[PDB]
């Protein structure tokens, strides 16, 4: 029972059916905003229900509007991990540099919630990787740290930055290195990750590095 209004909870329910009759007899109600500023469209987006997403994009409805937290459609669908809903979204116009509250867009909770698909979808669709939230933190600094091999090379191959710092000065690697992500830090490495940048607390990536991790990155670099 996640909202004020009816229509907003049939579509997290899934209730198509019920929906559909709600709009008939009210078409003003498939764009009335909730408590959250939240249409049906972003509950059947959280909640995965591509038909009900498919049937409100086809009635006209907005596509980018964002709830009281900056949420668009696509932010939620990208986050909840909906690969179709995505496809659609993005088919209908979605904006996909859309930013939230926080500075982040669609990619940066793909990139974080491990999206492999959905972050292909952004990116060859247009989503800028070196996108920075308030923290000045990208795609690759959340993927990095959470140990995301296989995102990082999507990152990578659709030209994401690996040298970029936040507001503490890490860089991506920084913080492969800080959760002890060995496969992800020799991948950055091995594109051009820097071994000398210094953060905020004027350590390098080898400083923050254990087990002689950076022993292996340094002679990565070094010979």
Known sequence: CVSN?????????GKLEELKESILADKSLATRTDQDSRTALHWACSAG?????????????????????????????????RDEIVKALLGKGAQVNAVNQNG??????????????????????????DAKDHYEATAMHRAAAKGNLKM??????????????????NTPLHLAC?????????????????????NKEEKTPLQVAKGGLGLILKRMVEG
Not at 5 to 13: E, I, K, R, T, W
Not at 55 to 81: C, E, R, T, Y
Not at 152 to 169: C, M, R, V
Not at 182 to 197: H, R, T
């Open 5 to 13: 209004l009816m229509v907003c909870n049939l579509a997290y329910s």
């Open 152 to 169: 990082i090379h999507i990152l990578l191959y659709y030209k994401a930055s690996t040298n970029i710092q936040d507001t503490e000065g």
């Open 49 to 81: 229900h591509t038909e009900i997403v498919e049937f409100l994009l086809q009635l006209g409805v907005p596509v980018n509007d964002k709830d009281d937290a900056g949420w668009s459609p696509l932010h939620i669908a990208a986050s909840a991990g």
């Open 178 to 198: 800080d959760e002890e992500r060995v496969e992800e830090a020799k991948l950055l490495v091995s594109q051009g990750a820097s071994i000398y940048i210094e």
């Open 104 to 129: 982040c867009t669609p990619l940066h909770y793909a990139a974080s919630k491990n999206r492999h698909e959905i972050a292909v979808m952004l990116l060859e669709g247009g989503a800028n990787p």
